Design a protein around this ligand. Structure first.
Ligand SMILES: C=CCN(C)Cc1ccc(-c2ccc(C(=O)c3ccc(Br)cc3)cc2)cc1
Ligand SMILES: C=CCN(C)Cc1ccc(-c2ccc(C(=O)c3ccc(Br)cc3)cc2)cc1
Ligand SMILES: CCCCCCCCOCCOCCOCCOCCO
Ligand SMILES: CCCCCCCCOCCOCCOCCOCCO
Lengths: 619, 619
């Protein structure tokens, strides 16, 4: 029955594997990437007509009937996104008259205009001179002077925010303006009677920061700022030291772009770091078959490869399958062996983690590290020496990364400061990197493969963490994946692997929750709205991935031979394509709950296989 | 008569011009470049067997009958050079028995062995573990803390020494040892009864430094060095900021190599700066037709192009010659527009100088800047806007670079501290960059082209400088060229161009000196020994370049229609080759008086043409 499905799924995945032996599916986000890229090019004065064209087809293509753009497919119109896309188009050549421009423009106005956009959006517009810098939250270079153990020092922010802050401080220090030609000026973004509904700091704004900000903008106007030169250079050097190998910065769109702008400000366009940083961009671009061109918010080669293996293995392929060995060898050459920013909290910890992308040594994440090691642990590579050795390093690194609450974060340890969440500047996404349930889950699942059970203190401290975090309905929040189905699946799957008794009450209370949301079509689905409106928890169109997750939670809980269980399997078997793959017009990945969503291209193929592979195991 | 000579010389130069429109002749030095490269590769663990082979052919090729190597062709055996070449070969594969190894080894021993070599040589050997680090002059990272106006701060050293110091401080901070395989160990470098004749600090060693050094080596042994981490990082960042565009550092062999080693020490082999720095090396390498491979101490594209133009122009070609325009346009794209280390002394000075090599913005030198501007001033480019503009920037820069004595240095202003010359570490070449006669001369000649005469204060202050520096015999020392013929020519030529009366006494006393050294063969020549033994002043085998220089001094002094004058011309006319070029088996370029000599490949073709072009002008 399901066998034929698996056979097709397997041969498919194997056909997607690159020559080097790794898998790499594109990452989907929203048009702000491409939109901001257009502006960046204008800033750096490097506009390629032909590319602008490809970027135009894309933008329009992504626009919806109402003439707006959303964060995820089938999502509500987003002001910020739409504003940036609007400005982008108008710059490329669109006239404010054309239908697309008209519809989008009207949506923007009906929202209070530009004054309702996030800090970033207003900042970008500020950079081109379409918005006063004075009305933009201030971040001083001086911030570079705060010590390791001081309120608001760059190491209190999450890795993804840290770099951005350092880069921007230099930019805001100079508050540069790169004028747009008249044809692109967008004053119409102000023409609106609707009251501006401004967004506030994530965790709420304290009058202190509010004042402090007003203070900064004032000090900004003085004719002399003592030690600012030093402050700037401190930031520059900080960047110069951590530039990724591919020329990026952290392997993410934000800092990379701002870092390049900062260098342009400091007349360093002929310096190696900038050059390498510039041409590095192409690697993240993507030619679209319909003529468009998109820029990836980040790349997931390692991540994809890791899950790809675990899936193919759990599916059936030999632990020494010559094709899976290509992956094993590849993964071993990826392991990081040098101190990263995480070393600031664990100086006596030995490097051994892995990164999300290709070459990003200063920022290994616990998630990848766990999945990679675990994946390797299920293989038989020619050189048992390095396999044995590597796993050990990674293992020990993961352990030494465990936070105080027994949980695991993504990049840093106990990065749980609550101070940064109140700054005026931080009004978008997460700013700190505290421990999460899904990351912790994957870790336990990893150790589990080795055998380490509940007896070991480390495991228990974590389990306790998860138990305390479980939601009233017995569900688990999904941090880097949409959402409760994603989390619950991970946890249960983990707990099952660490020896815990699946018969437990809270465990059962979880499985029930799963079966309780199984859509009529047999599969499961959860819309990204489940981050905003609690009514969508476990609700949404069924997707290959989300179905596989809920399917794993069941197989782990012993209910593999159940109705809902066998039903969900049917879904996957049926909805499968002739080539063996699966389609997924929806996003199941999460960047920042309620603010940034991602589309993991491989998920629709990997998880369904992994789930089916495990179902075939329960029989 | 000479006409046919010129026509052939011109068409020849034009045939050497690259497509982009610039000239670029290889730069010759000594085997220490290649020898150290071999060690570097070993250090970075990147040895290419095939390359080692090419490097071996070269090394042997350069070895003389006695089995030694010298700094210049036809020069006395050099210990340092020979030692490094010996170690290099033995590493590549040579056995201490083979004839070449035998002769060289004996010479080394007859000199007191390794204990008689320069600091660098012992340091390199220290890096591979063939010499105790303790016996190597110490240079602490802490040096990075000295302020702009403090004794021995990095800005008291010459640009070429500065970078090296910063890079090395990190290396000496860790005192790493990269062991050589047994087959390469060179203990035999100690086996000698001869008393070790150690070289001392350039300007003599003060017991203070001697003590201070002993102190540093002691502090080096402590279990804790407060703020050293910071000191190191201060040095690293300093390097990361000034890395050249081609991946080098200053565009010279020394710092570049040490900088790469320093990065290797700091586990930064996967960092962009290191990668770019590594592959950048290839650009300086050179394939030799006989199988060998040499590495250039530096590259002279700009320098060559500049003189090439002035020669072709003074020769006859139209100021708008389509071929000379390729050069003009090219040169304009070279001008630097950002602050360099020179800005530390002239913060309110606007960038406008040029560099010696292709892409080296942080280190423009007065010499190139002068020759380039002047060269442009003799052309008619399509865009008189930028030609006019560029010249002005460069001109004003040169002016603002003039030192206190009215003379011009090479890279910095008043870089005349005498303190660094006494440090134990500085026992090789120049360490400071004070004003010189030849540089000042070229500058005056430059302004002269514009018309600025002795009336202008700047010119007078300089002329006074030259007058005070003139030697008893009315000759002028040659700093960056061998030697008195080189200097005298420059000065006289300059003074003539700035309006000065050539009939003056000191001027005449100079010309006489020239005619007085004309060899029998009609031409002039000066051996590099003229830096060590004053008996060689103006003495040596005749060379195309040196003849052209002395020939210019005469043409400028009005004695163009003289016997010696017409005689020297005959030499050039006769000694010319069928293709129109000229041969020059001797070095006429100077790096560091008595310690480092260079061979400028283009000199033998450019100067002879320029001189003949000017002779044809006197008629
Ligand atoms: C399932 C595994 C997840 N795992 C932890 C890996 C991982 C880590 C981080 C990312 C990520 C990448 C880019 C962004 C932003 O665009 C962003 C936008 C705004 C700011 Br401010 C900063 C970054 C965000 C997140 C994606 C995947
Ligand atoms: C005729 C015009 C000259 N003009 C000023 C240009 C110019 C400037 C500097 C060079 C030069 C290059 C490399 C070296 C060393 O090898 C060296 C060796 C030891 C140490 Br310590 C540092 C550098 C030396 C000098 C060559 C040419
Ligand atoms: C340059 C001194 C080398 C000592 C560095 C080790 C510092 C410990 O890590 C602390 C965290 O800072 C992150 C460092 O890794 C980034 C690259 O900086 C270059 C050399 O480490
Ligand atoms: C960060 C300050 C930016 C202002 C630029 C003025 C820099 C003056 O340089 C002082 C001398 O140091 C030599 C410079 O070359 C180094 C490049 O530093 C890069 C940008 O500042």
């Amino acid at each position: 029955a399901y066998a034929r499905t698996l056979d097709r799924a397997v041969e498919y995945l194997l056909s997607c594997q690159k020559d080097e032996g790794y898998w790499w599916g594109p990452l989907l986000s929203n048009v702000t990437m491409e939109a901001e890229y257009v502006l960046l090019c204008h800033i750096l004065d490097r506009v390629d007509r032909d590319r602008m064209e490809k970027i135009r087809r894309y933008l329009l293509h992504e626009q919806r009937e109402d003439g707006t753009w959303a964060l995820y497919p089938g999502g509500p119109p987003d002001l910020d996104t739409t504003i940036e896309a609007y400005v982008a188009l108008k710059y490329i050549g669109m006239s404010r008259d054309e239908e697309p421009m008209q519809k989008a423009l009207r949506f923007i106005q009906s929202q209070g205009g530009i004054e309702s956009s996030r800090v970033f959006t207003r900042m970008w517009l500020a950079l081109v001179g379409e918005y006063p810098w004075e009305k933009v939250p201030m971040v001083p270079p001086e911030i570079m002077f705060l010590g390791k153990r001081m309120p608001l020092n760059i190491y209190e922010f999450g890795s993804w925010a840290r770099a951005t802050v350092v880069a921007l401080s230099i930019v805001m220090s100079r508050q540069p303006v790169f004028p747009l030609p008249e044809r692109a000026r967008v004053p119409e973004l102000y023409e609106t009677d609707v009251p501006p509904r401004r967004r506030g700091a994530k965790g709420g704004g304290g009058w202190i920061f509010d004042a402090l900000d007003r203070a900064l903008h004032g000090y900004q106007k003085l004719s002399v700022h003592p030690f600012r030169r030093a402050a700037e250079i401190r930031a520059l050097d900080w960047l110069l030291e951590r530039q990724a190998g591919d020329g990026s910065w952290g392997g993410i769109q934000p800092p990379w772009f701002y870092a390049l702008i900062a260098l342009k400000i400091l007349d360093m366009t002929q310096h190696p770091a900038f050059i390498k940083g510039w041409e590095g961009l192409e690697l993240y671009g993507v030619e679209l078959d319909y003529g468009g061109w998109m820029f990836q918010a980040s790349i997931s080669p390692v991540w994809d490869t890791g899950l790809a293996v675990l899936a193919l293995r759990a599916a059936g392929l030999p632990a020494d399958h010559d094709r899976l060995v290509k992956a094993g060898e590849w993964l071993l050459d990826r392991q990081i062996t040098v101190p990263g920013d995480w070393a600031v909290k664990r100086p006596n910890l030995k490097p051994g983690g892995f990164a999300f992308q290709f070459d990003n040594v200063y920022y290994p994440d616990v998630d990848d590290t766990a999945v990679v090691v675990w994946a390797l642990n299920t293989l038989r590579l020619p050189d048992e020496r390095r396999r044995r050795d590597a796993m050990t390093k990674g293992f020990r690194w993961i352990v030494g990364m465990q936070s105080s609450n027994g949980g695991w974060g993504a990049y840093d340890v106990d990065n749980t400061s609550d101070l940064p969440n109140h700054i005026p500047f931080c009004d978008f996404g997460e700013v700190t990197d505290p421990p999460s349930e899904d990351v912790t889950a994957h870790v336990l699942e990893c150790f589990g493969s080795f055998g380490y059970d509940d007896a070991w203190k480390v495991i228990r401290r974590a389990v306790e963490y998860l138990k305390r975090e479980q939601k009233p309905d017995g569900s688990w929040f999904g941090r880097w994946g949409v959402n409760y189905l994603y989390g619950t699946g991970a946890v249960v799957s983990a707990l099952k692997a660490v020896g815990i008794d699946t018969r437990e009450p809270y465990i059962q209370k979880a499985l029930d929750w799963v079966e309780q949301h199984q859509n009529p079509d047999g599969g499961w689905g959860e819309d990204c709205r489940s981050y905003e409106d609690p009514a969508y928890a476990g609700k949404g169109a069924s997707t290959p991935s989300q179905t596989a997750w809920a399917l794993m939670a069941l197989i782990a809980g012993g209910r593999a031979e159940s109705e809902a269980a066998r039903r969900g399997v049917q879904y996957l078997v049926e909805t499968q394509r002739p080539d063996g793959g699966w389609d997924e017009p929806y996003y199941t990945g999460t960047g920042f709950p309620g603010d940034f969503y991602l589309g993991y291209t491989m998920y629709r193929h990997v998880f369904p296989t992994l789930a089916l592979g495990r179902y075939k195991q329960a029989i």
